[PDB]
Design a protein around this ligand. Structure first.
Ligand SMILES: Cc1cc2nc3c(=O)[nH]c(=O)nc-3n(C[C@H](O)[C@H](O)[C@H](O)COP(=O)(O)OP(=O)(O)OC[C@H]3O[C@@H](n4cnc5c(N)ncnc54)[C@H](O)[C@@H]3O)c2cc1C
Ligand SMILES: Cc1cc2nc3c(=O)[nH]c(=O)nc-3n(C[C@H](O)[C@H](O)[C@H](O)COP(=O)(O)OP(=O)(O)OC[C@H]3O[C@@H](n4cnc5c(N)ncnc54)[C@H](O)[C@@H]3O)c2cc1C
Ligand SMILES: C[C@H](CCNCCCCN)NC(=O)c1ccccc1
Lengths: 497, 495
């Protein structure tokens, strides 16, 4: 009765999609891709807004373009058909502070130069160091400020740590939640902003039997039959038997398995239940919440000096002094505690001025946890949002040679026609943006348990199941190629005399 | 009669002696060939009494630089000014185009960074010249580079030539892109440093004008050395801090070459072989002392970009591979101030003094120094880049006032008074600037062989006997503290 399949992939993300791609590439037949949503791509979603303009509300860039297998693949096509599939939108960051204004590439602040030293500082703190406990990124930025106060001006000690935090937007975590040992990481080359990441999702989705894909099926349970087979159940009731299965649900969704309540959207009931080595890996790795807010304006009425703009939080000169007075490290850590609402200036905000990179009059901004859940929890209040960001929006426009902004959601002035927010933290099938490390996190743990699988037939792929390009789309891609290739290798023994 | 005999009065010998003395060791000799200490640390005076470090000038790796810490200590202590952090946003200038730094569309700095990462990868876990490498990158990534980026980038990234004192066709790629551990500290008089160390041990220990031309280790556990003129000396241990370049003459015929020390028996094979991994780097300097400051003080760091062509881009855009792009490169010399990248430190913004401290590289260094007496020629050679810098700095063409004629018309206009050039490549006690790598060198077998001395009596120190700060000032300083303590410990333990 239950349909016989060779390999059943759970999840139509880039990971499962690539698994499905590789499988068909290796002549594996009768396969099946089961996806809860009614769309493929998963955390690679391209939405539409005002005038029909499009933006990736999930991944946007191809990182490490020097080694990124997925990118080079995408680059090969464009190099052969001349079609624009991306664009290196790296630029010189423009740093704005509420009071001061633009403190970037400054002759007396030299902020970027001390950031690199701050970076190297961190590097010397870890990179090749056994034992060295962790501590938050915030703590680390404080330690540097303390161990080097003798060579930092009053303005550096104040404005530096704020610029330093643009990193929060790489990780999706606030500097107090972020693990230092993991804050600083190398980038293998420039970034390539994807001109339709969904453009990539589809290429891969059309590379294998279209009947393999069955959307809107939420997998409730996965069972390994003592007879060496895996049975998968969709909520709608359909049941399938398959020799192998490649599980690609988000680390967050997979985590729902180590708990009671089999009525949590997304959760899969595992029989036998996930190995103790897996669930326990969950303790040492966590989830981040990178969030996005697209600010669509009517026309490009602002300076395109750059495409990367970050607004620094707020700093106080009393801080400078505390750093100027602290006798020891703990004293500083202590003191500061001195004890209130969150506003657009309570954390760094990363704005991507698409008007220079894509010729579109919109701003793609990145937020981090905790602001993400908050902003996402109220994405439906387009007014409470415009109210929230108006100040930074104005401040930015001020520095970009333009007047304040005119809310025109429902003429040389900038008009905000529409606002789009991400829903990753609220999406039961997503539960966050992607993998991230908290202080004391051995991300190597999850990767190992994951890349090794539940057993011979219950495997794992996804941004968390791989090390190289972990958290990145291309990592999830490679993970898909991986698990499929292995399955493909095992099935190769089939045609042996 | 002497406990330790230190050969060389450089930063190495001076700390090596300082340390011995700080350890209570007596009867010591410091034998220098020159009439002064400091070695490659020499301060000189020019117009209106200004002082410039014609040799070392920066505190590198100020996060781990032991010496630098020591210096900041005193500063925190006695509030004096012993240095100024001058790392500034580099201003890149092309003859034709002008400034190209921090350009909204060229974004050279960003791609220069990919270039670095590209090199790092090219060598990560590997069993080629800096030029070969830039060409590889360009060919490999041309698909994601604009024509202008391809054109200028390579010329900009060559600022690295002034880190190694070598052109990008003679420098080893595997050693081009090292990494700096923290900001740099412009030493306000590196001589103030030479003097403090210098004064920390008994003055009557120094024997200036002693060209040690032979080191011998008598069987009966004694080390005896003789200086050119005559004076023979003997010691228990002997810290040889003469630079590599000179010590490399210890393996040739006509054993007389100035500064050439001849050991007996000779320097063991593990040492001789090390001199087969280049080290002929010649970084030179040329101070341009002006009347008064009258040019934009935007940045304290500037670099002129050797001319670049558009046919270069066309060739990169059309080459089918590393082989073709290689040959297609070459055609049809005349060396001008625009035949190489030039690094100008604008001392106006960092020190107040209306002067430019310029760094040059091999093979140019050798040329410009060999004509360091002809100020007229030196002015002609540099006038063009000097004017271009002035243009780009909200100023105007430089007036040659090296043979002065006070005139009012020189209101705003900048007036060049003096010009001071290094001589490192012609000084027999130097024979270049400092360690560098030719395509194929290996900065390890020399640092190790050297740090393992000849035997227990004959030790080596300097900027070519350590891995941390190798070739750098703090490196040598440390190599000297190293050889001393290692000896002061032995002597102490001897009952
Ligand atoms: C806001 C944001 C911005 C990002 N930006 C970048 C970037 O710029 N560059 C980059 O490289 N990466 C970026 N990433 C990360 C990148 O998007 C992910 O690493 C990648 O998309 C993960 O793909 P995946 O297949 O591993 O997981 P997913 O894309 O989440 O796919 C998992 C699939 O599982 C499905 N599913 C879950 N449970 C079930 C179930 N029980 N039954 C059936 N189906 C189920 C989900 O619907 C989903 O389709 C970003 C991520 C976010 C959230
Ligand atoms: C132009 C230039 C710029 C530089 N800038 C910097 C910088 O900014 N920052 C930095 O960290 N480093 C810099 N360096 C390198 C640094 O200055 C040197 O590595 C350092 O000075 C070496 O010190 P030393 O004691 O090891 O060698 P030396 O300074 O050469 O001392 C060795 C001594 O041995 C003497 N001697 C040689 N032969 C004999 C002999 N036969 N008998 C007796 N005595 C002899 C020599 O005269 C010399 O006095 C620069 C070098 C140059 C040339
Ligand atoms: C002392 C340093 C030379 C490089 N030293 C190499 C030793 C470090 C390798 N581990 N100075 C320079 O050439 C220089 C010149 C301009 C700006 C910065 C550095």
């Amino acid at each position: 009765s239950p349909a016989k399949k060779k390999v059943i992939i759970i999840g139509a993300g880039i990971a499962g999609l690539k698994a499905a791609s590789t499988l068909h590439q290796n002549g594996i037949q009768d396969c099946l891709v089961l996806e809860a949503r009614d769309r493929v791509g998963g955390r690679l979603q391209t939405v539409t807004g005002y005038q029909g303009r499009k933006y990736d509300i999930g991944a946007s860039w191809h990182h490490d373009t020097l080694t990124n297998p997925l990118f080079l693949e995408e680059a090969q096509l464009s190099l052969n058909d001349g079609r624009t599939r991306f664009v290196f939108d790296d630029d010189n960051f423009i740093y704005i502070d509420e009071e001061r204004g633009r403190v970037d590439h400054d002759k007396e602040l030299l902020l970027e130069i001390v950031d690199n030293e701050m970076s190297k500082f961190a590097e010397l703190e870890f990179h090749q160091h056994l034992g060295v406990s962790d501590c938050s990124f915030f703590q680390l930025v404080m330690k540097y400020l303390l161990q080097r106060r003798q060579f930092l001006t009053n303005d550096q000690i104040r404005y530096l740590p704020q610029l330093c935090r643009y990193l929060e937007l790489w990780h999706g975590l606030d500097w107090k939640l972020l693990s230092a040992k993991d804050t600083y990481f190398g980038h293998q080359g420039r970034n390539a902003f994807a001109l339709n990441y969904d453009s990539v999702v589809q290429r891969i989705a059309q590379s294998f039997p279209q009947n393999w894909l069955k959307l809107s099926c939420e997998v409730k349970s996965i069972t390994r039959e003592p007879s060496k087979n895996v049975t998968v159940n969709c909520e709608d009731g359909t049941v399938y038997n398959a020799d192998y299965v490649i599980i690609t649900v988000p680390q967050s969704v997979l985590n729902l398995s180590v708990q009671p309540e089999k009525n949590l959207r997304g959760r899969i009931e595992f029989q036998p239940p996930l190995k103790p080595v897996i669930q326990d890996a969950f303790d040492k790795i966590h989830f981040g919440a990178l969030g996005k807010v697209i600010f669509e304006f009517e026309e490009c009425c602002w300076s395109n000096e750059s495409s990367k703009i970050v607004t620094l939080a707020n700093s106080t000169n009393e801080f400078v002094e505390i750093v100027r007075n602290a006798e020891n490290l703990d004293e500083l850590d202590s003191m500061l505690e001195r004890e209130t609402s969150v506003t657009c200036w309570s954390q760094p905000l990363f704005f991507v001025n698409l008007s220079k990179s894509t010729g579109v009059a919109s701003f793609m901004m990145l937020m981090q946890a905790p602001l993400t859940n908050h902003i996402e929890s109220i994405r439906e209040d387009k007014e409470r949002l415009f109210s929230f960001f108006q100040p930074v929006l104005n401040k930015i426009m001020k520095c970009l040679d333009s007047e304040d902004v005119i809310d025109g959601m429902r003429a040389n002035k900038p008009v905000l026609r529409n606002i789009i927010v991400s829903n990753w933290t609220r999406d039961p099938y997503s539960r966050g943006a992607y993998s991230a490390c908290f202080p004391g996190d051995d991300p190597v743990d999850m990767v190992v348990a994951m890349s090794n699988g539940q057993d011979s037939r219950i495997r794992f792929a996804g941004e968390h199941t791989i090390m190289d390009g972990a958290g990145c789309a291309y990592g999830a891609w490679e993970s898909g190629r991986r698990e499929a290739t292995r399955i493909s290798d095992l099935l190769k023994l089939e045609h042996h005399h």
